[PDB]
Design an enzyme around this catalytic site. Structure first.
Site, PDB file in Angstrom:
ATOM      1  N   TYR A   1       0.849  -1.195   0.000  1.00  0.00           N
ATOM      2  CA  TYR A   1       0.000   0.000   0.000  1.00  0.00           C
ATOM      3  C   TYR A   1       0.893   1.256   0.000  1.00  0.00           C
ATOM      4  CZ  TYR A   1      -5.053  -0.443   0.157  1.00  0.00           C
ATOM      5  OH  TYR A   1      -6.353  -0.593  -0.228  1.00  0.00           O
TER       6      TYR A   1
ATOM      7  N   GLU B   1      -0.433   4.726  -0.885  1.00  0.00           N
ATOM      8  CA  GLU B   1      -1.266   5.893  -1.170  1.00  0.00           C
ATOM      9  C   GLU B   1      -0.485   7.208  -1.154  1.00  0.00           C
ATOM     10  OE1 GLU B   1      -4.418   4.035   1.164  1.00  0.00           O
ATOM     11  OE2 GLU B   1      -5.755   5.618   0.447  1.00  0.00           O
TER      12      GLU B   1
ATOM     13  N   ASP C   1      -6.621  11.999 -26.544  1.00  0.00           N
ATOM     14  CA  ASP C   1      -6.570  10.594 -26.058  1.00  0.00           C
ATOM     15  C   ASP C   1      -5.963   9.772 -27.164  1.00  0.00           C
ATOM     16  OD1 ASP C   1      -6.931   7.917 -25.236  1.00  0.00           O
ATOM     17  OD2 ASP C   1      -9.023   8.182 -24.671  1.00  0.00           O
TER      18      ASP C   1
ATOM     19  N   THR D   1      -3.553   4.665 -22.834  1.00  0.00           N
ATOM     20  CA  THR D   1      -3.425   3.364 -22.211  1.00  0.00           C
ATOM     21  C   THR D   1      -2.078   2.823 -22.567  1.00  0.00           C
ATOM     22  OG1 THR D   1      -4.444   2.327 -24.177  1.00  0.00           O
ATOM     23  CG2 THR D   1      -5.864   2.924 -22.319  1.00  0.00           C
TER      24      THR D   1
ATOM     25  N   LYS E   1      -2.149  -1.452 -25.586  1.00  0.00           N
ATOM     26  CA  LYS E   1      -2.436  -1.616 -26.991  1.00  0.00           C
ATOM     27  C   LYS E   1      -1.135  -1.653 -27.792  1.00  0.00           C
ATOM     28  CE  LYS E   1      -6.875   0.614 -26.554  1.00  0.00           C
ATOM     29  NZ  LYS E   1      -6.867   1.107 -25.160  1.00  0.00           N
TER      30      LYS E   1
ATOM     31  N   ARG F   1      -1.998  -3.625 -18.679  1.00  0.00           N
ATOM     32  CA  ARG F   1      -3.238  -2.887 -18.677  1.00  0.00           C
ATOM     33  C   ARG F   1      -3.131  -1.753 -17.648  1.00  0.00           C
ATOM     34  NH1 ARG F   1      -6.304  -5.876 -22.013  1.00  0.00           N
ATOM     35  NH2 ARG F   1      -8.093  -4.441 -21.853  1.00  0.00           N
TER      36      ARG F   1
HETATM   37  C1  8UU Z   1      -4.594   6.931   3.442  1.00  0.00           C
HETATM   38  C2  8UU Z   1      -5.980   6.513   3.836  1.00  0.00           C
HETATM   39  N1  8UU Z   1      -6.894   6.063   2.956  1.00  0.00           N
HETATM   40  N2  8UU Z   1      -8.156   5.773   3.513  1.00  0.00           N
HETATM   41  C3  8UU Z   1      -7.991   6.037   4.812  1.00  0.00           C
HETATM   42  C4  8UU Z   1      -6.661   6.537   5.167  1.00  0.00           C
HETATM   43  C5  8UU Z   1      -6.263   6.915   6.555  1.00  0.00           C
HETATM   44  C6  8UU Z   1      -5.745   8.357   6.613  1.00  0.00           C
HETATM   45  C7  8UU Z   1      -6.046   9.327   5.617  1.00  0.00           C
HETATM   46  C8  8UU Z   1      -5.582  10.658   5.664  1.00  0.00           C
HETATM   47  N3  8UU Z   1      -5.904  11.617   4.639  1.00  0.00           N
HETATM   48  C9  8UU Z   1      -6.273  12.994   5.071  1.00  0.00           C
HETATM   49  C10 8UU Z   1      -6.043  13.979   3.929  1.00  0.00           C
HETATM   50  C11 8UU Z   1      -6.583  13.401   2.642  1.00  0.00           C
HETATM   51  C12 8UU Z   1      -6.383  14.377   1.460  1.00  0.00           C
HETATM   52  C13 8UU Z   1      -6.495  15.889   1.720  1.00  0.00           C
HETATM   53  C14 8UU Z   1      -6.105  16.646   0.462  1.00  0.00           C
HETATM   54  O1  8UU Z   1      -6.835  16.584  -0.563  1.00  0.00           O
HETATM   55  O2  8UU Z   1      -5.039  17.305   0.494  1.00  0.00           O
HETATM   56  C15 8UU Z   1      -5.771  12.197   2.253  1.00  0.00           C
HETATM   57  C16 8UU Z   1      -5.973  11.076   3.279  1.00  0.00           C
HETATM   58  C17 8UU Z   1      -4.841  11.008   6.795  1.00  0.00           C
HETATM   59  C18 8UU Z   1      -4.528  10.103   7.817  1.00  0.00           C
HETATM   60  C19 8UU Z   1      -3.688  10.598   9.001  1.00  0.00           C
HETATM   61  F1  8UU Z   1      -2.623  11.279   8.548  1.00  0.00           F
HETATM   62  F2  8UU Z   1      -3.341   9.642   9.859  1.00  0.00           F
HETATM   63  F3  8UU Z   1      -4.421  11.421   9.730  1.00  0.00           F
HETATM   64  C20 8UU Z   1      -4.982   8.790   7.714  1.00  0.00           C
HETATM   65  C21 8UU Z   1      -5.317   5.798   7.076  1.00  0.00           C
HETATM   66  C22 8UU Z   1      -5.901   4.368   7.080  1.00  0.00           C
HETATM   67  C23 8UU Z   1      -3.947   5.747   6.378  1.00  0.00           C
HETATM   68  C24 8UU Z   1      -7.478   6.860   7.483  1.00  0.00           C
HETATM   69  C25 8UU Z   1      -7.322   7.262   8.697  1.00  0.00           C
HETATM   70  N4  8UU Z   1      -7.116   7.601   9.786  1.00  0.00           N
HETATM   71  C26 8UU Z   1      -8.681   6.359   7.111  1.00  0.00           C
HETATM   72  N5  8UU Z   1      -9.706   6.283   7.946  1.00  0.00           N
HETATM   73  O3  8UU Z   1      -8.938   5.883   5.768  1.00  0.00           O
HETATM   74  C1  PLG Z   2     -13.192   0.132   3.672  1.00  0.00           C
HETATM   75  C2  PLG Z   2     -12.252   0.376   2.516  1.00  0.00           C
HETATM   76  N1  PLG Z   2     -12.745   0.454   1.270  1.00  0.00           N
HETATM   77  C3  PLG Z   2     -11.987   0.672   0.191  1.00  0.00           C
HETATM   78  C4  PLG Z   2     -10.602   0.830   0.245  1.00  0.00           C
HETATM   79  C5  PLG Z   2      -9.919   1.110  -1.066  1.00  0.00           C
HETATM   80  O1  PLG Z   2      -9.151   0.063  -1.615  1.00  0.00           O
HETATM   81  P1  PLG Z   2      -8.283   0.441  -2.904  1.00  0.00           P
HETATM   82  O2  PLG Z   2      -7.079   1.021  -2.174  1.00  0.00           O
HETATM   83  O3  PLG Z   2      -8.135  -0.967  -3.474  1.00  0.00           O
HETATM   84  O4  PLG Z   2      -9.010   1.444  -3.739  1.00  0.00           O
HETATM   85  C6  PLG Z   2      -9.909   0.790   1.564  1.00  0.00           C
HETATM   86  C7  PLG Z   2      -8.399   0.950   1.738  1.00  0.00           C
HETATM   87  N2  PLG Z   2      -7.958   1.679   2.913  1.00  0.00           N
HETATM   88  C8  PLG Z   2      -6.531   1.851   3.158  1.00  0.00           C
HETATM   89  C9  PLG Z   2      -6.024   1.025   4.327  1.00  0.00           C
HETATM   90  O5  PLG Z   2      -6.782   0.524   5.169  1.00  0.00           O
HETATM   91  O6  PLG Z   2      -4.820   0.853   4.450  1.00  0.00           O
HETATM   92  C10 PLG Z   2     -10.795   0.542   2.725  1.00  0.00           C
HETATM   93  O7  PLG Z   2     -10.294   0.470   3.964  1.00  0.00           O
HETATM   94  C1  PLG Z   3      -9.357   6.108 -27.077  1.00  0.00           C
HETATM   95  C2  PLG Z   3      -9.597   5.101 -25.963  1.00  0.00           C
HETATM   96  N1  PLG Z   3      -9.575   5.502 -24.677  1.00  0.00           N
HETATM   97  C3  PLG Z   3      -9.785   4.696 -23.621  1.00  0.00           C
HETATM   98  C4  PLG Z   3     -10.030   3.328 -23.733  1.00  0.00           C
HETATM   99  C5  PLG Z   3     -10.290   2.596 -22.431  1.00  0.00           C
HETATM  100  O1  PLG Z   3      -9.309   1.714 -21.965  1.00  0.00           O
HETATM  101  P1  PLG Z   3      -9.724   0.726 -20.789  1.00  0.00           P
HETATM  102  O2  PLG Z   3     -10.503  -0.312 -21.571  1.00  0.00           O
HETATM  103  O3  PLG Z   3      -8.348   0.344 -20.308  1.00  0.00           O
HETATM  104  O4  PLG Z   3     -10.536   1.429 -19.772  1.00  0.00           O
HETATM  105  C6  PLG Z   3     -10.102   2.721 -25.098  1.00  0.00           C
HETATM  106  C7  PLG Z   3     -10.386   1.240 -25.364  1.00  0.00           C
HETATM  107  N2  PLG Z   3     -11.301   0.976 -26.456  1.00  0.00           N
HETATM  108  C8  PLG Z   3     -11.654  -0.389 -26.805  1.00  0.00           C
HETATM  109  C9  PLG Z   3     -11.012  -0.845 -28.105  1.00  0.00           C
HETATM  110  O5  PLG Z   3     -10.520  -0.016 -28.894  1.00  0.00           O
HETATM  111  O6  PLG Z   3     -10.994  -2.054 -28.378  1.00  0.00           O
HETATM  112  C10 PLG Z   3      -9.877   3.661 -26.233  1.00  0.00           C
HETATM  113  O7  PLG Z   3      -9.917   3.217 -27.499  1.00  0.00           O
END
Ligand code: 8UU
Ligand code: PLG
Ligand code: PLG
Ligand code: 8UU
Ligand code: CL
Lengths: 442, 442
Positions: free
Chosen positions: A54, A56, A208, A234, A237, A243
């Site tokens: 992870y 982020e 694009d 992308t 292709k 991907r």
């Molecule tokens: C990185 C991340 N993703 N989703 C989360 C987090 C946590 C988190 C998030 C964040 N964020 C606050 C700012 C936001 C973007 C603001 C901008 O646009 O500038 C970015 C994320 C901060 C923390 C922290 F720093 F511990 F307080 C934890 C954590 C698990 C790492 C979090 C908590 N606490 C929770 N609840 O959920």
């Molecule tokens: C409840 C929940 N849902 C969605 C996501 C998003 O997953 P992707 O990063 O695959 O988009 C997180 C990740 N949260 C960050 C952490 O707990 O470390 C989560 O805690």
């Molecule tokens: C111009 C353009 N932009 C974006 C995408 C989207 O890519 P993802 O499928 O990774 O989201 C395609 C795919 N177009 C389908 C094809 O030409 O067969 C595309 O042709």
């Protein structure tokens, strides 16, 4: 406390199907314009333990530590992307986290205009993508049509982009962004005139280039970096990557767009990046810059020209009567068959292609064409002389498709019934399989 | 016309860093609550040639043909998902195309309520995710706050969900969707009680169980399927899958939800599925259903309990004074240090954890905690007895952190200066590296 057995022992059911898939790819004439075949090294990255992490945020601004080695890979990737697309890292920035093309375009669009923002794109039926604002009377099909206000500019009756229609629309509609670069457009784009229209309305220029990325990289086709504020692409292709997607933004034209784009990808839309993607992308971006890959990209265009020319020699109509790139769209109206029928026929002979709309079609149900491309077959070592044989197989498939439509009629249900067991198809498939089966396979 | 050389020969620069990354994972005490380690089989799928294929749409409704094997893999995954989560395929459907958690939640939310739709979720500072509607007065941080209208419900001063506050907000705010299931919440959820609030307002019940998926699947914790219309989960955390996501929808409770959700994933937001993910997910989903994986899940809870207890024995405060699941959040206020300081400290000793807010906190700069979890270390073979040593290492790091704050001051730049070369840290790192390097590594 884990099971480390190999894939074959752990999940024999799945492993058989994947060996099946591998074999179908091995024995298929793949003309999907958007498909390619990745080398072993790009797939080593996709299977790497780097996806365990992870990370982020962005490099040197991670939420978590232990991202020293991940920071190097994300930075090596952006460096390599800016190199491959011949742009100065001072003048252009790049975001390497979008998970796919569709995510990249919604994210970049959001950054520029926000919710309810006004955008313009080419219609799906004329070669535009879904993420260029596509909607229908019945519903707003793409999020790009729903979260934004979108207007769509059709191509003319010859299949060319009609800039006059774009301008007339741009002036009345007054969007914040105009998108160019398309999903099934067989000619090059005049970015200059797009830039001219955008200045008249004070709109951003979004290019694009996913389908033509390799051409742009290697200076074979017009360069949108000279005129565009945003460039998306992308990686899977013609570029031959995994991907994934890339977003390019022009800092000089728009300072403080770097943060807008970067915040849109995260945290506006995405969470943790997929570091295996990023590593795989970096691995392919090295290869892109090499002179060997230019030769391959040149070969894609040579094969594409030869293919178009051979299809015309057999009296087949192409939209715009030719091509400037890797793809062709066949107009099937003179044969009185639909693209959907030809696709089934081609699936029965292990020829991969997709149905596609043409200018005259009033609806995406029953499109009058198919679209083909050379990047996959060029990857597998086919040269210009091999294109007559591909053109030959397509003409034979068109003929059989007409024969079967004569016998069972135009209803797809009925037409498909003729397909299983057909002597000529078994013979054509076999021919396809023998030639496809021996071509180099990464 | 390709380069088939292995990754080491093709890209020595990238291959070094990945060997480096491999070494750091091998020699780290990984307490990131959301991290795990995938087995070799899951990585064989991620590296499979199946990612070459474009298959827009769903099985038996593919735009392109030549998806016979891809159709089988997608169906085997959806089957295996419904098996794993103990739901009847007549009553529940599953979408397996979302590329990641954040994408799945945005997609599912859109399906339910559309643009301008009203939603409620837990605040980020209180343990909610970004994709649960997070914003700040200054800026709409998540697209979920921007493309929807969101309200945020805080946990009480003890770190618990206060349902009175939820209801008081639901009745006045009148949302269409209410989200539960969280990113850093150490207790179980009363889903039944959430359903009761949702029915009173006529809102949908959305449960995001990404952190606790395994517990829900193997029946150790409360089952949101009994009361929820939509369940989302990622596949890469406790579930130990690849980086992907699943959306579950209750057909019985709401008919025509199937099309709404499937339409949202495609073509509304995404394009082509990433078939290597789906294959990879299917592979892990087999493992999830085995009685062996339940044992591992049980071990995650046993270890999480033992860890909390050992931290408390060393006079460390835990939010809610304990845990029902895989995660703990440490309240550092009695030590007058921030979580940012402890995280750097911990990175210097190869201990992976993340800073986290607590109820008292009013800012995501200077959060007063760290969050830890046991799934990764449970994956590496650590048992209950090993938790004292982890707890011992964290207490030592907390101590060292207090010493360095005493010496160089509370400013983070000044504090960080203290870390390089510190004798105790060097010694603690090596102690960590010797114990971590010995543990089984998938
Ligand atoms: C990185 C991340 N993703 N989703 C989360 C987090 C946590 C988190 C998030 C964040 N964020 C606050 C700012 C936001 C973007 C603001 C901008 O646009 O500038 C970015 C994320 C901060 C923390 C922290 F720093 F511990 F307080 C934890 C954590 C698990 C790492 C979090 C908590 N606490 C929770 N609840 O959920
Ligand atoms: C409840 C929940 N849902 C969605 C996501 C998003 O997953 P992707 O990063 O695959 O988009 C997180 C990740 N949260 C960050 C952490 O707990 O470390 C989560 O805690
Ligand atoms: C111009 C353009 N932009 C974006 C995408 C989207 O890519 P993802 O499928 O990774 O989201 C395609 C795919 N177009 C389908 C094809 O030409 O067969 C595309 O042709
Ligand atoms: C599948 C897909 N994705 N992006 C595309 C397409 C093409 C295409 C799209 C579509 N779509 C139209 C309907 C839309 C969803 C409607 C709904 O159910 O809500 C789904 C997509 C149809 C075709 C067609 F008509 F089958 F040839 C090609 C093509 C490359 C296969 C296309 C064309 N022509 C263009 N320009 O772009
Ligand atoms: Cl992947």
């Amino acid at each position: 406390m884990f099971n480390n057995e190999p894939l074959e022992q752990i999940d024999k059911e799945l492993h058989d199907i994947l060996a099946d898939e591998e074999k179908r790819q091995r024995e298929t004439i793949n003309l999907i314009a958007s498909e390619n075949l990745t080398n072993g090294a790009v797939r080593e990255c996709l299977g790497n333990r780097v996806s365990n992490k992870y990370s982020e945020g962005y490099p040197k601004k991670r939420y978590y530590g232990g991202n020293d080695f991940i920071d190097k890979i994300e930075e090596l990737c952006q460096k390599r992307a800016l190199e491959a697309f011949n742009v100065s890292d001072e003048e252009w920035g790049v975001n390497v986290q979008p998970l796919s093309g569709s995510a990249a375009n919604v994210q970049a669009l959001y950054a520029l205009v926000g919710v309810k923002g006004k955008i313009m794109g080419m219609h799906l039926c004329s070669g535009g993508h879904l993420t260029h604002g596509f909607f229908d009377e019945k519903k707003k099909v793409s999020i790009t049509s729903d979260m934004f206000e979108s207007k769509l500019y059709k191509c003319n009756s010859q299949g060319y982009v009609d800039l006059d229609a774009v301008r007339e629309m741009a002036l009345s509609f007054k969007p914040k962004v105009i998108i160019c670069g398309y999903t099934s457009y067989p000619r090059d784009i005049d970015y200059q005139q797009f830039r001219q229209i955008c200045d008249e309305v004070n709109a951003y220029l979004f290019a694009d280039i996913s389908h033509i990325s390799s051409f742009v990289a290697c200076n074979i086709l017009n360069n949108p970096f000279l005129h565009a504020d945003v460039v998306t692409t992308t990686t899977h292709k013609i570029l031959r990557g995994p991907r994934s997607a890339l977003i390019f933004f022009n800092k000089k034209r728009n300072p403080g767009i770097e943060q807008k784009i970067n915040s849109a990808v995260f945290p506006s839309f995405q969470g943790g990046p997929h570091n295996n993607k990023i590593a795989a992308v970096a691995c392919q971006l090295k290869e892109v810059h090499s002179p060997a890959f230019k030769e391959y990209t040149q070969q894609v265009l040579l094969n594409s020209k030869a293919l178009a020319k051979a299809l015309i020699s057999k009296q087949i109509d192409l939209v715009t009567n030719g091509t400037d790139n890797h793809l062709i769209v066949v107009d099937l109206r003179k044969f009185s068959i639909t693209g959907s029928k030809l696709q089934e026929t081609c699936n029965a002979i292990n020829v991969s292609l997709n149905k596609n709309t043409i200018p005259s079609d009033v609806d995406c149900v029953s499109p009058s064409g198919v679209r083909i491309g050379t990047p996959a077959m060029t990857t597998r070592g086919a040269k210009e002389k091999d294109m007559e044989f591909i053109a030959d197989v397509l003409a034979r498939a068109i003929k059989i498709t007409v024969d079967l439509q004569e016998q069972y009629g135009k209803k797809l249900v009925d037409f498909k019934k003729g397909l299983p067991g057909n002597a000529q198809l078994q013979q054509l498939k076999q021919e396809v399989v023998t030639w496809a089966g021996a071509l180099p396979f990464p």
